[PDB]
């Protein structure tokens, strides 16, 4: 009954997702109760037809019921305040910002596909002496001694002294699971660990949404400069297997072709995968080596052809 | 575009590259450079010939399979080199606007497109007759030469035509 | 009249060898060469030819506006159909003379 | 009140007795005021026919032909509606 | 115009409260301090309502109760010379067309068309404004 | 250069692998293969900003560059290393040569431009319309290096003018003519764009004829 | 409200024509070869940049 | 609807001399012949290079590149099994950057052909590239990568 | 006219090289008074007939069109009087509103002329106002039979 009453909400795979699903179930129950009573009122006042027995006498013509108005403007405030309190307590576990993530994934989303960096890994049980690279974060300070003019301008740069073509906000890592247009990226994560996602956009705003995480975030170009808390954490992922993930903000024309996967594997599988990726290998090769289907099993890199009626 | 001296210089297939167009003219060894006075009148005549200018276009090897050839013009092309008269088949303006990756020779005077891939037949605009295709080949030394003459009158059409 | 005092109609090929640097040593008709001479070499020749061409455009435009006036107001009826006819011939002549005029400097 | 009422004697010459009336066109007597509806019907039919005939030509695309068909169908539908309504006495 | 002014006074009070609370709770408890977009927008919509309500209050204090604003007012009380309301005019469509020309000139970055559209807008606004003041031709 | 290639690959990975795979092979029906296009093509396209294109249409429009000069050089070096092809001209220091591309002769450049370029652009470098949704952009914005690389590579529907077809001297002359025609003030008043008949007729009908008709309305009477 | 007309009745005529012609030029992006505005109705910032 | 399914920009070949042959798992890019010719033909018995780039499409690999020989006896010096979700650059196309400038497996799989038959620029010559997956005829062209014009003799008017 | 000759540049031939059969430009328009003939050339749909061993190119279509245009323009007053019956000596003008059918016909003709002129300019219109060149050509082709009808109807009703 819960699945049907959830209105097609996938059963979460994280503690945060489970808690959000429970809040959604409660809020939908409240909304359906309110809707049921209001629709009952409407379909019961629809029983007040103009009865032919109604002689030349108009209705009670009352209007203006102050006590009833007060009651029906007090109760909605109570309902929405209870819902707001539940919302706040659930929100509190939206980004706990635990300063000790078990694996940090640098999710950089460029125009029409994804890339995952594996910035850092630090298992609580003790493992994964791994770290991000960051030699490639090179700035584009246009601080030339002189510009077109002969002297004086000594232009530094448009924005904070730099150029919009900066890309310094982007972070890069040794293990990059770049997603090609013909190969859906598959970010592989260890099961049972705390996974942080550091979110960024190379070109334009778009949205990282794993539907089974019951949570999305908007990867913006420069979240730090836009006062956006791009980085967000997930306490745990219980269920293993492949979970589809999608782009949920306008990217451009190929906004519907940015699907990726978040394949949750066991911690030992993650050990093997990261070792085999440190060794020169691709994501598909590492998946095959850890004995898991290499290509995204929940989605395909569907046709680059503009459509069905195009003549190939 | 050299001002006056050696205005027309022999040409080689290697000079053009896939998806390239070059306006060529009918130059003869006798019509040497413009240094002399006997020359520079032959050269002026070549330049001012209404039906003289031709466009040599290099069809991409990948797109060579989309080419459809005309009757009596199947062997006119030298490999992937196609020579079509620049004079538009409709009122005779040059059709110089060559579009590659579409292979459409557009005329600016009245916006008529000719499909270069197929024999240069008009696929839009006032034109109704295809551009005349010059037979081309390479002579000794590899220079491009015409392998004949147009099998049809090349300028714009007129009453005494198509017979 | 001023323009004809400086214009030479001919296709006789000549290299410019004038003042206009962007066209030097280029074969051109004497008509184009003398149009360039009017534009550059002659004091106020550019202005005279520009006002001539603008007068041609205004001549055509005002003929069109006058034709619209008379047609819409019915000034062509019984007494003046001949006037309408000769005015139409005048409009045709103006059109073709403007054609020949901006065709005169071989461009 | 700084205006003087105008009066005019316009030389008249059809006697505007079979055609349009002042009720329909207030200034019928002052100038050419009615074109036979047959002229408009035949003109619309010929315009639609010309639009259809323009499909035959040198153009590989067919968006142009579909636009021609749509406009010709609109013209034919308008002419048919007008003709039918007039035949039935401007009914429906 | 007491109620007319009081509407905007209430709106101004609410918007001032909203701007103040937003500014405070964004200067603290936000990622980067004051948002500076919502804050400014709220402050200047408070200013919108404040200007309108202040003018309406000035008018209400300057005006004796109108029949419109007076409960228990008979129709004959307000009966009288209503002011000039513009009859038919074709200048609005010309103004709209001129502004559309300027707008397309801005969209398609055509400075010549922008200039033409601005000149047409000036002409059409002049026509609309002078429509009922142009005197008779003096010959 | 090693670091230049690394930077170019880095930018390529997060810019355009959605349209030409990490191997630079063209993604079928989204973008053409970059193998052999060359540093010159990459420079022209990215510097003009045309290429990081966010739609498939009749013609990819020009737009503000999405990469600075150093990043453009990184992209070009990466693509040259992967495919190998034409290289953008450069001066003695190493920067992309622009002044050096201004050919000495301008009459020759103008003749070449008219024979080859004006065909679709204009007499004086303005734009021109093409078959269906395409167009030739106005050259006034293109700097000499961009003009030279635009000749060297055929971006889209522009014939590819190889160095053999137009030797660097002829290309430099064409660049000089383009810059001269773009930066030359219009002699004889405001130059209405560059198109003569259409702008001139519009200007007549608006300025001259509105002036004449308004003056006629002023002088005469209404009745 | 019992009024005969609106406060500025030539202004509301302008408002309708500003609506009509303003609307037409927005929908007119379709006739262009590229198409109408591809970005969403919300038209978020970087996607709408040149 | 000029931005529909059939769009000019999307349906464009690269503006490069080499042809593209996507047939087979491995896609061939910028496949041309460097055969500098001083006369009508490149005479038989002269070795000319076969440039191209073999890009692997499927990461699951087709790195064999068995023979890729046709009329011309194409030999693959320094052959290697490079293509695995990557590129195999057989030679050094004119303007190619020496990304390494060192002997990495000697030459990078340079393909050279002893013609045994005249060829000339502007013609298309069939080459059968055969990987373990399959074989494809490519119809390679002749490309003068970065060579300038060869001075044509001055003309003596007659 | 002097102010225009000063401030506005008209036909800057120096930018336009000397005529050569090979050199071209994208604009290629005549003055506005011949722009309508050029637009007729552009719009008329490439209909050529081939009698026994001969050709009748698309140019003759426009030649006949111009002939018809001039003939009708010259012979309108006589056409007008044949149609209406007016053989009276008219010295008082008619207001265009007072003569609807003639006003409608004149509006229709002006609409056709403007459509032809903008069709001739379709190259620059397509270039600047981002419309496909084929789209402008076919807009002209369809509108040269649609826009005249729309303008006739609108002008007739407007006069009434
Ligand atoms: C299809 C439907 C959609 C159409 C979209 C186009 C809308 C714009 C065109 C209509 C504007 C004109 C109008 O409504 O008709 C008024 C006018 C009737 O006026 P009336 O009040 O009944 O006159 C009675 C007496 O004459 C006495 O009456 P009066 O006292 O009021 O005086 C006569 C009236 C009559 O004045 C006029 O007729 C002026 C005509 C202006 C036409 C503007 C053309 C804009 C291009 C539109 C393209 C289509 O008064 C004047 O204003 C005379 C001074 C002239 C002013 C000229 C101002 C130019 C402004 C340019 C601004 C820039 C806009 C660019 C966009 O209608 C016409 O006679 C003209 C026909 C319509 C023009 C077609 C344009 C093509
Ligand atoms: C941003 C867009 C700017 C919008 C500005 C127009 C909006 C104002 C509407 C509310 C004002 C009150 C009103 O009802 O207007 C009366 C009137 C409506 O007349 P009505 O409905 O028939 O009733 C009779 C009036 O109530 C009887 O009162 P009235 O006719 O005597 O109206 C008096 C003043 C009415 O008071 C005002 O409207 C103040 C004028 C301030 C507007 C200044 C433009 C600022 C924007 C430039 C930056 C963008 O009239 C004037 O004498 C001065 C009008 C000057 C307008 C100048 C606009 C030119 C724009 C191009 C500037 C070029 C630079 C950019 C490059 O509206 C106008 O005259 C303004 C025309 C609309 C222009 C839209 C431009 C597109
Ligand atoms: C044969 C034919 C007419 C084919 C169709 C091509 C065509 C003309 C399409 C319309 C052009 C337009 C209006 C494009 C904008 C986008 C569009 C279609 C919007 C919807 C149209 C619509 C119903 C809008 C509602 C409000 C409305 C009426 C807006 C009109 C806006 C405009 C542009 C008004 C002015 C009309 C106008 C000037 C159109 C261009 C015509 C010409 C020949 C301009 C000539 C000209 C040019 C081309 C210059 O470059 C130039 C440069 C420097 C100085 C002068 C000029 C100059 O005069
Ligand atoms: C007063 C003059 C105004 C004109 C009056 C006439 C009104 C009648 C309008 C008739 C409309 C007819 C439109 C059809 C036209 C047509 O047939 O062409 C198409 C393009 O469709 C279009 O957008 C058409 C949009 C039509 C819009 C109508 C515009 C009305 C405006 C002009 C009115 C405002 C007037 C303002 C006057 C200003 C005052 C003046 C003083 C396809 O081109 P193409 O590009 O090649 O498409 C390829 C595919 O085919 C192929 O599949 C695929 O492969 C692709 O490759 C693709 O390219
Ligand atoms: C009684 C006669 C009164 C006539 C008024 C005369 C106007 C005086 C204008 C100013 C003085 C003379 C300027 C001469 C120097 C000069 O030419 O002026 C250009 C500017 O040009 C533009 O942009 C246009 C700027 C907009 C203002 C001018 C618009 C006036 C129009 C509206 C008058 C005609 C009427 C038409 C009505 C239209 C409406 C129809 C309903 C400026 O350079 P630029 O801007 O960079 O030009 C680019 C090259 O650089 C680059 O290569 C090149 O490739 C191009 O991109 C070029 O634009
Ligand atoms: C309301 C319902 C309107 C209809 C709603 C559906 C609209 C869908 C339109 C485009 C979708 C994108 C596909 C874009 C590709 C086109 C489809 C295709 O694949 O067909 C190929 C040819 C070119 O291919 P070709 O090789 O060069 O030539 C082939 C050689 N034999 O196009 C064609 O047939 C053109 C056929 C496309 C349909 C026509 C669209 C214009 C309709 C205008 C209606 C206006 C009515 C006016 C009313 C006043
Ligand atoms: C149609 C044939 C054609 C001819 C021939 C041609 N062009 Fe172009 N040109 C184009 C087209 C189409 C584009 C658009 C390319 C793009 O947007 O990627 C273009 C783009 C350009 C640009 C880019 C301008 C900018 O700001 O982005 C320049 C510069 C240029 N051409 C100059 C030249 C020069 C120099 C020649 C010397 C002969 C020439 N063209 C010949 C059609 C042509
Ligand atoms: C699908 C969107 C798209 C993206 C994003 C894109 N390209 Fe392209 N690319 C194309 C298309 C389509 C063409 C051919 C048409 C054109 O260039 O307008 C092309 C052509 C090119 C060319 C010219 C090819 C030739 O033969 O002249 C170069 C160089 C190029 N791309 C490099 C790049 C670089 C570098 C980037 C990243 C900065 C990039 N592209 C991003 C689609 C794209
Ligand atoms: C790609 C295909 C598929 O789409 C279609 O077929 C839909 C086409 C709908 C019909 C459009 C007809 C053109 C508008 C005619 C308006 C009347 C003109 C006469 C009066 C001057 O189709 C296409 O090729 C392109 C599809 C996009 C078409 C966009 C049309 C946008 C209309 C815009 C120019 C404004 C119209 C002005 C209406 C004026 C009437 C109110 C005053
Ligand atoms: C400028 C005036 C244009 C005058 C054309 C004079 C045409 C003479 C040659 C016609 C001919 O028989 O040649 C073969 C023909 C092409 O093929 C056919 O047999 C079937 C064709 C079906 C289409 C018929 C349309 C006829 C329309 C004209 C009668 C209307 C003219 C007005
Ligand atoms: C061409 O490049 C653009 C194609 C746009 C595809 C979507 C079709 C939109 C049609 C909606 C109706 C247009 C307005 C109708 C006015 C009568
Ligand atoms: S002059 Fe070339 S199509 Fe008409
Ligand atoms: Cu998305
Ligand atoms: Cu995205």
- CB C97, CB C2: distance < 8 Å: no
Burial of F183 (0-12, 13-18, 19+ CB in 10 A): exposed
CB E114 within 8 A of CB E105: yes
Q: How many domains does chain H have?
A: 1
Q: How far is I47 from chain G (nearest CA, A)?
A: 27
What kind of experiment solved this structure?
Answer: cryo-EM
Rg of the Cα trace of chain D? 21
Residue at token pair 């008379």: C70
The set of long-range contacts for A134-139, using a CB threshold of 8 Å and a minimum separation of 24, is A134/A171, A134/A172, A134/A173, A136/A172, A136/F6, A136/F7, A136/F10, A137/A168, A137/A170, A137/A171, A137/A172, A138/A168, A138/F7, A139/A166, A139/A168
Longest dimension (CA), chain F: 85
Please report which residue ranges of D1-92 form alpha helices under DSSP H.
37-53, 63-88
Q: How far is CA A14 from CA A85, A91, A299, F156, H24, in A?
A: 22, 15, 21, 50, 43
Distance A305 CA to ligand 13 centre (A): 19
The phi, psi pair for G3, rounded to 5°, reads -80, 155
Contact by Cβ (8 Å): G21, A182: no
- A244 beta partners: A261
- According to DSSP, the residues that pair with H33 across neighbouring strands are H50, H142
Least Cα separation, residue E138 to chain A (angstroms):
59
**Domain map (residue ranges) of chain B:** 1-146
Q: Any chain G CB within 8 A of the CB of A205?
A: yes
H85 inside 8 A of chain A by CB:
yes
Q: How far apart are CA F16 and CA A253, in angstroms?
A: 14
E-chain residues near G21 (CB < 8 A): 96-97, 99-100
Q: Which of F125, F131, F122 is nearest to F58 (CA)?
A: F131
Hey, is the C-beta of A144 within 8 angstroms of any chain F C-beta?
no
CA of E94 to the centre of ligand 1 (A): 7
Beta bridge partners, A98, equal none
Please, which residues 143-162 of chain B have a Cβ atom closer than 8 Å to chain C? none
Q: Which residues of B are annotated as a binding site?
A: 88, 90-91, 93, 107, 110, 112
**Which residues of B participate in the annotated binding site for [2Fe-2S] cluster?**
88, 90-91, 93, 107, 110, 112
Say which CATH topology domain B1-146 has: Rieske Iron-sulfur Protein (2.102.10)
H122: left (phi over 0), alpha (psi -120 to 50) or beta: left
Q: Is F167 in the pocket of ligand 7 (CB under 6 A)?
A: no
Which residues does ligand 1 sit against, CB inside 6 Å? Answer: E 90, 93-94, 97-98, 101, 120, 123-124, 127; I 154
Nearest-angstrom CA–CA distance, I90 and A171: 88
Residues facing residue A114 across a β-bridge: A109
Of I47, I92, I99, the CB nearest to D32: I99
Q: Which residues, in sequence order, are bridge partners of residue H125?
A: H140
CA distance A251 to F160: 33
Number of CB pairs, chain G paired with chain I, less than 8 A apart: 10
The rounded distance, in Å, linking the Cα atoms of B24 and B53 is 6
- What domain count does chain D have? 1
> What is the H or E stretch that residue B58 is in?
strand B54-58
The answer to whether F80 touches H96, Cβ cutoff 8 Å, is yes
Contact present, A241 and A188 (Cβ < 8 Å): no
Q: Report CA(H2)–ligand 4 centroid distance (Å).
A: 11
User: What is the sign, positive or negative, of the torsion defined by CA atoms of B3, B5, B8, B13?
Assistant: negative
The structure tokens listed for F81 are: 């290393």
Tell me if H3 is assigned to some domain.
no
Examine residue H84 and state whether it is found in any structural domain, yes or no: yes
The per-type count for chain D, helices as H runs and strands as E runs, is 2, 0
Across the beta sheet with A260-265, the strand order is A186-190, A260-265, A241-247, A206-210, A215-219
Which residues pair with residue H124 across a beta bridge? H141
At H77 the three-state DSSP class reads strand
Ligand 7 pocket test, pick from B95, B99, B105 with the greatest ligand atom count within 8 Å of Cβ, gives: B99
Query: What is the spatial order of strands in the sheet that B121-124 belongs to?
Result: B97-99, B104-107, B112-115, B121-124
- Helix extents (H) in B16-68: 42-48
CA C75 to chain I, closest CA, distance in angstroms equals 6
Backbone angles phi, psi at A235, to 5 degrees: -65, -40
- In DSSP terms, B22 is beta-bridged to B56
Q: Do G38 and A253 touch (CB under 8 A)?
A: yes
Which residue has 């400086």 as its token pair? C6
Q: Which residues contact I22 (CB under 8 A, 6 or more apart)?
A: B23, B25, B47, B52, B53, B86, B94, B96, F115
Say whether residue A204 is in contact with chain G using an 8 A CB cutoff. yes
Resolution in A: 3.5
Give me the residue label for tokens 């001129």.
E98
Structure tokens at C82: 């001949």
Token pair for residue E80?
Answer: 């009288």
Count of CB atoms situated within 10 Å of the CB of I160: 16
| Gap between the Cα atoms of H44 and H113, Å rounded | 10
d(CA E27, CA F123): 60
Q: How remote is the CA of residue E125 from the centroid of ligand 2, in Å?
A: 8
Region of C37 (left: φ > 0; alpha: ψ -120 to 50; beta: rest) is alpha
Q: Where are the extended beta strands (E) located within chain A?
A: 103-110, 113-116, 120-123, 127-130, 186-190, 195-201, 206-210, 215-219, 232-234, 241-247, 260-265
Residue F207 DSSP label: I
Chains in touch with B (3+ beta-carbon pairs under 8 Å) read C, D, F, H, I
- In whole angstroms, what is the distance from residue G17 CA to residue G21 CA? 6
Q: Which sign does the torsion angle of CA E50, E56, E59, E64 carry? A: negative
**Does H106 fall in a domain?**
yes
CA gyration radius for chain G? 17
**Dihedrals phi, psi of C74, to nearest 5 degrees:** 65, 40
Give the domain extent around D90: 1-92
Q: CA–CA distance from D74 to each of D51, D67, D70, I153 (Å)?
A: 11, 11, 6, 15
Query: Distance (Å) from the C-alpha of residue E77 to the closest C-alpha of chain A?
Result: 30
Q: What does the alpha-carbon distance between residue C73 and residue I106 come to, in Å, rounded to a whole number?
A: 11
Residue C5: Cβ-neighbour burial (10 angstroms; 0-12, 13-18, 19+): exposed
Atom of ligand 5 nearest to the CA of E115: 32
| Residue with CA at minimum distance from ligand 11 atom 2 | H1
Tell whether B47 lies on the interface with C, counting CB pairs under 8 A. Answer: yes
Place of tokens 């009276």: I88
Whole-angstrom distance, CA of residue B108 vs CA of residue F193:
18
- For residue D34, give the 3-state DSSP assignment: coil
Judge contact between D20 and D34, C-beta under 8 A. yes
What is the C-alpha to C-alpha distance for residues B69 and B76, in angstroms, rounded to an integer?
A: 9
Cα(F45)–Cα(H97) distance, rounded to whole angstroms?
20
Q: Which two tokens stand for residue C93?
A: 């002549």
CA distances from A77 to A27, A70, E10, I116 (A): 15, 11, 22, 68
**Backbone CA torsion sign across B97, B99, B100, B103:** negative
Q: Is residue H133 part of a domain?
A: yes
How far is it, in rounded angstroms, from Cα A287 to Cα H92? Answer: 35
**Residue I19 per-residue DSSP state:** P
Answer whether C27 touches F (CB < 8 Å). Answer: no
Give I123 Cα–ligand 3 centroid separation in angstroms.
12
| Residue A106 · residue A117 · CB < 8 Å | yes
- Rounded to 5 degrees, φ, ψ at D7 are -145, 140
Q: Give the closest of H14, H20, H89 to F37, CB-based.
A: H14
F117 within 8 A of F170, measured Cβ to Cβ: no
């Amino acid at each position: 009954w819960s699945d049907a009453l959830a209105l097609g909400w996938p059963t979460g795979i994280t503690p945060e997702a489970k808690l959000n699903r429970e809040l959604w179930i409660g809020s939908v129950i409240a909304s359906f109760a309110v809707g049921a009573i209001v629709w009952g009122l409407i379909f019961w006042t629809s029983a007040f037809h103009r009865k032919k027995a109604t002689d030349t006498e108009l209705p009670r013509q009352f209007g203006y019921n102050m006590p009833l108005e007060l009651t029906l403007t007090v109760i909605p405030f109570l309902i929405i305040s209870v819902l707001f309190y539940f919302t706040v307590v659930v929100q509190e576990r939206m980004m706990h910002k635990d300063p000790n993530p078990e694996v940090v994934i640098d999710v950089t989303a460029f125009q029409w596909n994804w890339k995952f960096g594996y910035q850092k890994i630090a298992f609580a049980d003790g493992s994964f002496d791994y770290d991000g690279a960051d030699p490639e974060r090179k700035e584009a300070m246009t601080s030339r001694p002189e510009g077109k003019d002969e002297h004086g301008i000594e232009k530094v740069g448009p924005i904070r002294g730099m150029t919009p073509e900066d890309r310094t906000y982007l972070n890069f890592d040794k293990i990059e699971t770049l997603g090609t247009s013909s190969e859906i990226p598959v970010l592989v994560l260890p099961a049972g660990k705390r996974i942080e996602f550091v979110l960024n956009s190379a070109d334009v705003i778009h949205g990282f949404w794993v539907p089974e995480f019951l949570f999305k975030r908007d990867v913006l170009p420069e979240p730090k400069a836009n006062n956006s808390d791009n980085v967000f954490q997930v306490s745990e992922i219980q269920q293993t297997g492949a979970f589809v993930g999608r782009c949920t903000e306008m990217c451009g024309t190929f906004h519907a072709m940015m699907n990726f996967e978040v394949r949750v594997v066991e911690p030992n599988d993650f050990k093997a995968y990261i070792d085999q990726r440190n060794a020169g290998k691709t994501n598909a090769e590492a998946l095959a080596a850890i004995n898991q289907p290499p290509l995204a099993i929940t989605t395909e890199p569907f046709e680059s052809r503009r459509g069905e009626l195009v003549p190939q | 575009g050299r001002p006056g001296e050696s205005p027309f210089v022999k040409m080689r297939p290697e000079d053009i590259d896939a998806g390239g167009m070059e306006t060529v003219f009918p130059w003869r060894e006798s019509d040497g450079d413009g240094t002399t006075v006997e020359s520079e009148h032959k050269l002026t005549e070549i330049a001012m010939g209404v039906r003289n200018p031709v466009m040599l276009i290099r069809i991409k090897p990948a797109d060579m399979h989309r080419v459809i050839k005309r009757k009596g013009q199947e062997s006119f092309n030298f490999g992937e080199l196609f020579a079509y008269t620049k004079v538009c088949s409709h009122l005779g303006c040059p059709s110089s606007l060559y579009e590659q990756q579409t292979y459409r020779i557009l005329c600016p005077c009245h916006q008529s497109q000719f499909d270069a891939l197929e024999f240069a037949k008009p696929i839009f605009g006032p034109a109704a007759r295809a551009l005349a295709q010059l037979p081309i080949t390479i002579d000794e030394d590899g220079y491009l030469v015409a392998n004949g003459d147009f099998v049809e009158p090349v300028g714009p059409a007129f009453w005494e035509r198509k017979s | 009249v001023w323009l004809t005092l400086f214009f030479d109609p001919s296709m006789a090929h000549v290299t410019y060898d004038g003042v206009y640097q962007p066209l030097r040593g280029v074969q051109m008709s004497r008509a184009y060469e003398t149009a360039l001479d009017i534009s550059f070499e002659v004091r106020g020749g550019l202005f005279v030819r520009q006002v001539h061409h603008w007068a041609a455009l205004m001549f055509a435009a005002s003929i069109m506006v006058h034709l619209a006036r008379i047609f819409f107001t019915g000034a062509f009826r019984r007494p003046r159909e001949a006037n309408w006819v000769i005015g139409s011939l005048l409009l045709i002549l103006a059109m073709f003379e403007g054609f020949f005029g901006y065709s005169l400097p071989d461009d | 009140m700084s205006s003087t009422q105008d009066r005019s004697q316009l030389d008249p010459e059809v006697e505007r007795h079979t055609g349009v009336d002042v009720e329909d066109v207030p200034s019928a007597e002052w100038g050419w005021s009615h074109m036979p509806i047959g002229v408009m019907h035949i003109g619309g039919l010929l315009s639609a026919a010309f639009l259809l005939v323009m499909m035959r030509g040198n153009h590989v695309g067919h968006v142009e032909d579909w636009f021609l068909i749509g406009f010709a169908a609109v013209i034919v539908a308008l002419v048919g509606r007008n003709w039918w309504l007039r035949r039935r006495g401007w009914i429906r | 115009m007491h109620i007319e002014a009081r509407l905007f006074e209430i709106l101004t009070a609410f918007f001032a409260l909203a701007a103040v609370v937003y500014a405070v709770l964004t200067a603290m408890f936000a990622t980067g301090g004051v948002e500076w977009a919502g804050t400014t927008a709220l402050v200047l919509t408070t200013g919108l309502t404040l200007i309108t309500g202040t003018f309406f209050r000035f008018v209400a204090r300057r005006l004796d109760t109108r029949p419109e604003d007076y409960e228990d007012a008979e129709i004959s009380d307000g009966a009288g010379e209503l002011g000039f309301f513009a009859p038919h005019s074709w200048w609005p469509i010309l103004i709209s067309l001129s502004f559309s020309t300027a707008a397309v000139g801005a969209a398609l970055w055509l400075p010549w068309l922008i200039a033409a559209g601005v000149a047409f807008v000036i002409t059409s606004v002049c026509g609309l404004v002078f429509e009922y003041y142009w005197g008779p031709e003096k010959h | 250069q090693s670091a230049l290639l690394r930077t170019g690959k880095q930018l390529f990975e997060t810019s355009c692998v959605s349209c030409h795979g990490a191997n630079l092979q063209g993604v079928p029906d989204r973008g053409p293969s970059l193998i052999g296009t060359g540093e010159a093509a990459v420079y022209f396209q990215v510097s003009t900003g045309r290429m990081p294109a966010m739609r498939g249409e009749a013609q990819a429009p020009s737009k503000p560059p999405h990469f600075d000069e150093s990043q453009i050089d990184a992209l070009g070096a990466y693509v040259q290393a992967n495919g190998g092809g034409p290289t953008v001209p450069r001066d003695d220091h190493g920067a992309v040569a622009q002044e050096s591309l201004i050919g000495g002769d301008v009459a020759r450049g103008g003749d070449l431009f008219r024979l080859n370029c004006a065909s679709c652009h204009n007499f004086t470098g303005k734009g021109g319309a093409l078959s269906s949704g395409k167009y030739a952009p106005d050259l006034g914005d293109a700097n000499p290096a961009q003009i030279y690389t635009a000749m060297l590579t055929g971006p889209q529907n522009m014939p590819k003018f190889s160095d053999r077809q137009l030797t660097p001297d002829e290309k430099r002359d064409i660049v000089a003519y383009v810059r001269e025609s773009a930066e030359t003030p219009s002699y004889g008043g405001y130059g209405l764009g560059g198109f003569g008949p259409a702008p001139e007729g519009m200007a007549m009908w608006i300025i001259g004829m509105v002036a004449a008709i308004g003056v006629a309305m002023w002088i005469g009477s209404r009745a | 409200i019992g009024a005969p007309d609106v406060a500025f009745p030539r202004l509301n005529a302008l408002s309708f024509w500003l609506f009509l012609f303003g609307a037409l030029i927005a929908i007119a992006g379709f006739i262009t070869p590229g198409g109408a505005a591809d970005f969403g109705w919300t038209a978020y910032s970087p996607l709408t940049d040149a | 609807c000029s931005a529909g399914q059939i769009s000019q920009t999307t349906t464009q070949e690269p503006a490069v001399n080499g042809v593209n042959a996507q047939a087979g798992q491995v896609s061939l890019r910028n496949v041309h012949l460097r055969a500098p010719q001083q006369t009508d033909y490149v005479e038989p018995g002269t070795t000319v290079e076969l440039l191209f780039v073999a890009a692997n499409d499927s990461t699951e690999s087709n790195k064999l590149k068995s023979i890729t020989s046709d009329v011309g006896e194409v030999t693959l010096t320094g052959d290697s099994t490079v293509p695995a979700d990557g590129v195999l650059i057989v030679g050094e196309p004119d303007g190619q950057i020496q990304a390494v400038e060192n002997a990495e497996a000697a030459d990078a799989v340079t393909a050279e052909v002893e013609l045994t038959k005249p060829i000339t620029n502007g013609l298309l010559y069939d080459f059968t590239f055969t990987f373990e997956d399959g074989e494809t005829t490519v119809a390679v062209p002749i490309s003068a990568g970065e060579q300038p014009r060869r001075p044509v003799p001055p003309a003596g008017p007659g | 006219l002097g102010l225009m000759g000063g401030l506005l540049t008209i036909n800057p031939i120096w930018n336009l090289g000397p005529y050569k059969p090979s050199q071209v430009s994208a604009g290629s328009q005549p003055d506005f008074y011949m722009m309508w003939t050029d637009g007729l050339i552009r719009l008329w749909p490439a209909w050529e007939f081939y009698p026994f061993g001969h050709t009748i190119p698309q140019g003759v279509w426009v030649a006949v069109g111009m002939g018809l245009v001039f003939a009708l323009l010259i012979a309108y007053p006589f056409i007008e009087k044949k149609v209406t019956g007016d053989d009276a000596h008219h010295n008082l003008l008619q207001r265009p509103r007072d003569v609807p059918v003639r006003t409608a016909i004149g509006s229709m003709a002006i609409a056709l002329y403007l459509l032809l002129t903008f069709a001739c300019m379709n190259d620059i219109i397509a270039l600047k106002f981002h419309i496909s060149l084929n789209a402008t050509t076919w807009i002209g082709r369809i509108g040269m039979v649609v826009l005249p009808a729309i303008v006739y109807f609108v002008a007739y009703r407007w006069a009434i």
